[PDB]
């Protein structure tokens, strides 16, 4: 029955069911699975067969087809000519820096005819094309469906979400890439241009090789005035639309106007369409219009019948591919183009309004599936266009050819590996042209950071741009993109993560929807006349105008009825009825971002007590989220369908008899807290904070150190950070149990006292308890891993050994006794800066070492040393070094509310203030950090933490709970013997006098960030030098120097310290002396030991001047002289 006042548990139970049935990288997994299941098949099958002749004759030539289909894909395998091949464990790939890839196979049928009319076709099964990198936890990954015990047996983390590639033993994550939706008409109005309005519809076939062929239909911005032009792909100039229609095949004018204005009784449309009509009253038949288009083509034909064919080809294939490319699709293309013109006229008259570019209904997300499809298609075409070349090279002589040698298996696998390993998304030749940032290295510092990096979108618009409109949070981001979570750098709003229940559609064929549609009462375009098209409604399927229906109602209900039972229409498909404007659109393509919503009838939910009960007893009745969807209780609603629907925040508070607001709801939200992301779902009371605080906390949640993964000891990984004693927060949101934050937490529930104790926390800093740090408070250990491989020439063989002084020539003062005789350190040996770790020497044509030295000022201990063979069969070693990081002053600490700060001082327990009991705060922060930041959520967290630690319960900090507030928390606290507002009477730790003011104190969940001070502190005193210009090197690792930049130079000018400026830029960087002739200001030649100073070109040898110069200045002068410029510097 109806469920009253049990919502606070029913909604979270169904949310738990959703997060049990679907994981957190479900979009990644589904996209990659759909790719490797069907998109690779369609890409490999739709490629045309290649037929190839000889060089047109031999004396005074037959061909073959070579068509292939039916792709086969196998599980990952690993060994080559050394043993029988065995499956690749992903952990083994990580350790050995392999590429966790899977070989794909096809069977080819080459049918060849030569002479005598005898056809023989030979089929080659399981032909090898390459090895495709495969995503972890995918449907063909070796970890698919394995139980937690098996995953632990394989040294894999059961909590690892997967969704990433292992390539060269490095985790790669395909960041989702935004783009404008395809096959849809957008009417825009750019401000400063020759034309006022422009309507574009970038078009794509069902994943064809052709790119987005974008067509614009535009209207001029002011004789006659307001002509309509349509710039066309592969056409240099704009073409008036009526000429386009006449070229398409409509000789008359009434027929053309029947495709644009659907109701002839509207004269306002005619008054604006006739200025374009009277522009082209000189073309009356199809061929002259074809000639007109061909003259404007990029490749202008020399004769008339060549332009005719070129323009016919352009109209047949380039323009509007999604509406069809076949023998006769002229009527459908004309209908769609007339619809585009009608859409432009509606915006020109103001009957409708301009479409919004930031409306994420108009956006599509390119996940792993679509991205790998786009890149594999190009590489596959490149493979075919080299099989063809090999075939030509053998058939010109005509002896025979072998497809096994013809197939170059390197190209596909190497292209995939390069693209995913580097991020340059495209061919390697166009490294600068291809967009970068895709397939980033997975951030593996915290589990929340890993989840956030696996759920991340990207807007491929240029950064450092002054147009803030794309960066702004759009209204259509509700519940699909986290409003709080975004980087604070130059990528604000451009890089955005994914909401919790937000799911990205994976795509399916619209053909079943088409056969379902064509059988109720609708008519295809070819059947009807435009007489009855004005009163009825236009149906769009994936953006292509399929037909016309007289009754929009009871077909909308029918489509919803089928989608709610999953009869023919799958759940991801979205049906959208625009009502004031008669379009009714159906979308099935991939990349549509959507979230689940409840179904609401008259004023009641379809979710019932019976649903909640049979789903609460899950793991026995297996009534999962999929069964809940099949029950017709929830739907997946994308942004398009979210425009035409009416939601309610809470069924109890928004579906009741009262002063009526809507009384016509259609959907309800499961819980509003699901609009947050992953890093923002760990914020307690996030609605009690200023939003920039929440953004900063979402950014710093990726930097808080903790147990980032369970198998961190088998995981030989560089820059690994784990905390000794992580704790789940005393006060938590109900959304953490789905992020598994209470299983892999990053932080300790510290007792903070928000007070000004001594002044060492004044400017946003913090005091720590030295005794707590001694007891292990926020103590962590830093793992750094070092890799090395021996090899590279004919005789320069790399080898691991202990370099011996009399044998090897080049050696540091570092002691090499710590090495074992095989050239490595045994694990468990204390190490420090400038200590050899891997003794590697190269033969000198006696020997020279290439030993790896421990990074300066690390001073850790070797944890474990692994030796193995890379894919080239050479010895490969990785060494991991432990180094614990005791919290010292300057280490960056932060809370769950964007209140960051470095430790300012550490007092012992005696020096630290204390309550009536012996409770001394672990942390003291400045109260002057609250009032401007307005992190009232921090104060409420500090209060609820005390309440929870006294009650024995775990505090609940769900954002929009509305069942807990400050008054209730205070009343609960007052029962345990404390002041109701959390204040306590602390005593001064030094004098013992009780502090006149009462101190606000309580347990708060603080986090330790990776930004330690020992990893940032560095100095320099005449260290190493760069090679090109003799200035100090750059970087902390290279013992570099700080940059006395152009603004510091200006500041010194303003100080008027000219001697200090010269000291900084000349002696402290690169003092240098050069010899210049007094006659010509050109640099001369100086031989100091013989004191022979001659300037050739003058033959003086006598009057020569020495001038002191920065080396950068000398090298600038030399570059100028290389550019034939003659900077002459006379000292007179």
């Amino acid at each position: 029955e109806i469920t009253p006042d049990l919502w606070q548990e029913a909604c979270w139970i169904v949310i738990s069911s959703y997060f049990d049935e679907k994981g957190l990288v479900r979009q990644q997994l589904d996209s990659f699975d759909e790719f490797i299941q069907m998109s690779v098949q369609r890409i490999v099958e739709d490629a045309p067969p290649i037929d190839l002749q000889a060089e047109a004759q031999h004396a005074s030539p037959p061909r073959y087809l070579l068509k292939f289909e039916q792709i086969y894909l196998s599980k990952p395998t690993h060994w080559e000519r050394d043993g029988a091949p065995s499956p690749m464990m992903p952990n083994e790939a990580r350790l050995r820096n392999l590429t966790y890839s899977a070989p794909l196979y096809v069977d080819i049928t080459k049918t060849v005819i030569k002479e005598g009319e005898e056809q023989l076709q030979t089929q080659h099964q399981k032909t090898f094309i390459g090895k495709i990198p495969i995503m972890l936890r995918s449907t063909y990954c070796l970890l698919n469906g394995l139980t937690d015990r098996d995953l632990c047996e394989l040294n894999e983390c059961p909590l690892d979400p997967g969704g990433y590639f292992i390539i060269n033993g490095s985790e790669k994550v395909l960041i989702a890439q935004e783009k404008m939706a395809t096959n849809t008409v957008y009417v825009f109005a750019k401000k400063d241009s020759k034309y006022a309005y422009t309507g574009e519809c970038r078009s794509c076939l069902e994943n064809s090789s052709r790119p987005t062929s974008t067509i614009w239909v535009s209207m001029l911005a002011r004789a006659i005035g307001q002509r309509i032009v349509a710039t066309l792909p592969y056409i240099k100039q704009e073409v008036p639309i009526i000429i386009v229609f006449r070229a398409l095949g409509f000789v008359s004018d009434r027929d053309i106007l029947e495709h644009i204005i659907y109701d002839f009784e509207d004269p306002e449309m005619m008054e604006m369409v006739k200025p374009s009509l009277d522009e082209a009253f000189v073309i009356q038949e199809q061929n002259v219009a074809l000639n007109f288009i061909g003259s404007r083509g990029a490749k202008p034909g020399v004769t008339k019948e060549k332009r005719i064919k070129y323009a016919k080809e352009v109209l047949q294939k380039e323009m509007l591919p999604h509406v069809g490319v076949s023998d006769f699709c002229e009527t459908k293309k004309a209908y769609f183009l007339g619809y585009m013109v009608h859409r432009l006229l509606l915006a020109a008259l103001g009957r409708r309004e301009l479409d919004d570019r930031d409306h994420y209904g108009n956006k599509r997300l390119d996940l792993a599936g679509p991205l790998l499809a786009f890149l594999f298609r190009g590489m596959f075409k490149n493979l075919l266009k080299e099989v063809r070349i090999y075939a030509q090279k053998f058939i010109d002589r005509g002896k025979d050819f072998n497809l096994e040698l013809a197939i170059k298996t390197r190209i596909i696998s190497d292209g995939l590996k390069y693209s995913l390993a580097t991020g340059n998304w495209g061919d390697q030749k166009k490294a600068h042209q291809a967009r970068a940032g895709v397939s980033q290295v997975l951030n593996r510092l915290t589990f929340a950071s890993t989840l956030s990096h696996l759920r991340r979108l990207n807007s491929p618009i240029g950064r450092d741009g002054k147009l803030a409109k794309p960066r702004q949070l759009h209204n259509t981001l509700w519940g699909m993109v986290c409003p709080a979570e975004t980087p604070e750098g130059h990528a604000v709003g451009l890089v955005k993560n994914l909401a919790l229940m937000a799911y990205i559609s994976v795509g399916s064929q619209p053909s079943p929807i088409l056969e379902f549609l064509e059988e109720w009462s609708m008519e295809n375009l070819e059947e009807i006349s435009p007489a009855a098209i004005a009163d009825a409604t236009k149906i769009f399927v994936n953006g292509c105008w399929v037909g016309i229906h007289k009754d929009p109602e009871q077909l909308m209900n029918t489509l919803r009825k089928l989608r709610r039972q999953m009869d023919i229409i799958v759940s991801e498909v979205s049906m959208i009825r625009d009502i004031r404007e008669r379009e009714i659109r159906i979308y099935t393509d991939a990349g549509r971002i959507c979230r689940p919503l409840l179904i609401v009838e008259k004023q009641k939910l379809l979710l019932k007590k019976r649903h909640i009960d049979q789903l609460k007893e899950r793991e026995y009745n297996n009534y999962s989220w999929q069964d809940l969807v099949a029950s017709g209780v929830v739907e997946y609603i994308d942004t398009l369908e979210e425009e035409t629907v009416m939601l309610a925040m809470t069924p109890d508070d928004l579906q009741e008899k009262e002063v009526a607001y809507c009384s016509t709801y259609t959907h309800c939200e499961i819980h509003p807290s699901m609009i947050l992301g992953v890093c923002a779902s760990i914020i307690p009371f996030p609605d009690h904070n200023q939003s920039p605080r929440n953004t900063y906390q979402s950014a710093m949640g990726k930097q808080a150190m903790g147990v980032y993964i369970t198998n961190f000891h088998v995981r030989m990984d560089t820059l690994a950070h784990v905390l000794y004693y992580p704790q789940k927060p005393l006060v938590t949101t109900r959304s953490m149990e789905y992020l598994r934050f209470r299983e892999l937490p990053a932080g300790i529930n510290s007792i903070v006292a928000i007070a000004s104790y001594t002044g060492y926390n004044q400017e946003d800093s913090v005091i720590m308890n030295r005794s707590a740090v001694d007891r292990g408070f926020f103590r962590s250990v830093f793992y750094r891993s070092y890799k090395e491989q021996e090899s590279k020439g004919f005789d320069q063989e790399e080898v691991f050994e202990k370099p011996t002084r009399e044998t090897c020539q080049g050696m540091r003062h570092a002691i090499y006794d710590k090495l074992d005789d095989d050239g490595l350190i045994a694990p468990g040996v204390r190490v420090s800066g400038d200590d050899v770790i891997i003794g590697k020497t190269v033969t000198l044509p006696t020997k020279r070492d290439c030993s790896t030295f421990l990074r300066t000022s690390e001073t850790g201990i070797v944890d474990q040393v692994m030796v193995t063979l890379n894919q080239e069969g050479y010895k490969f070693c990785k060494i991991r070094v432990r180094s614990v990081r005791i919290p010292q002053i300057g280490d960056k600490f932060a809370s769950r509310h964007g209140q960051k700060g470095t430790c300012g001082i550490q007092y012992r327990q005696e020096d630290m203030p204390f309550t009536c009991e012996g409770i001394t705060p672990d942390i003291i922060i400045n109260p002057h950090a609250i009032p401007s930041r307005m992190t009232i959520g921090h104060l409420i967290e500090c209060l609820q933490g005390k309440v929870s630690a006294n009650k024995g319960e775990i505090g609940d900090a769900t954002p929009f709970n509305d069942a807990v507030n400050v008054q209730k928390i205070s009343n609960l606290l007052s029962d345990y013997g404390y002041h109701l507002r959390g204040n306590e009477v602390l005593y001064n730790g030094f004098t013992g006098r009780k502090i006149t003011s009462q101190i606000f104190i309580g347990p708060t969940y603080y986090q330790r960030l990776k930004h330690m001070v020992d990893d940032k502190i560095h100095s320099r005193a005449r260290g190493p030098i760069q090679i090109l210009n003799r200035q100090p090197m750059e970087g902390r690792s290279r013992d570099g120097g700080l940059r006395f930049g152009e603004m510091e130079r200006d500041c010194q000018i303003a100080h008027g310290a000219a001697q200090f400026l010269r000291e900084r830029l000349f002696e402290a960087s690169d003092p240098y002396q050069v010899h210049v002739c007094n006659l010509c200001g050109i640099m001369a030649i100086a031989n100091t030991r013989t004191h022979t100073y001659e300037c050739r070109g003058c033959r003086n040898k006598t009057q020569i001047s020495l001038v002191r110069m920065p080396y950068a200045c000398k090298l600038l002068f030399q570059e100028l002289m290389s550019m034939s410029i003659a900077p002459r510097m006379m000292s007179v």
Binding site: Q428, K429, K430, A431, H432, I1027, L1028, N1029, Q1031, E1046, L1065, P1110, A1112, C1113, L1115, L1116, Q1118, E1119, M1121, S1122, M1123, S1124
Partner: protein, 98 residues
């Protein structure tokens, strides 16, 4: 004028030559080829394309990027760093090193 080794240093076994050194090598290759053709062959047709390509190479030596012209690229397709680009603006010789 060919800049000295200090302007175009060559590192040892990454010996690896400089981006400008590669362009200078192309310059001397095409100059020698054009010379020997102009005495021995004197075809007056291949000489035109030879001079055109030598002009392109010497121009892209000082200025890699030009409108309407291909960029000079070293292996793997990455464009070369010409002298203009070396001293153009920020992180250039003057603004980034003086």
């Amino acid at each position: 004028p060919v800049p000295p080794l200090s302007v175009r240093p060559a590192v040892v076994m990454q010996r690896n030559q400089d981006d400008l050194t590669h362009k200078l090598a192309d310059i001397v290759k095409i100059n020698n080829q054009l010379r020997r053709n102009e005495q021995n062959g004197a075809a007056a047709h291949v000489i035109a394309e030879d001079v055109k390509l030598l002009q392109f190479h010497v121009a892209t030596m000082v200025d890699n990027e030009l409108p309407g012209l291909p960029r000079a690229m070293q292996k793997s397709g990455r464009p070369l760093k010409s002298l203009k680009q070396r001293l153009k603006g920020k992180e250039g010789r003057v603004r980034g090193n003086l």
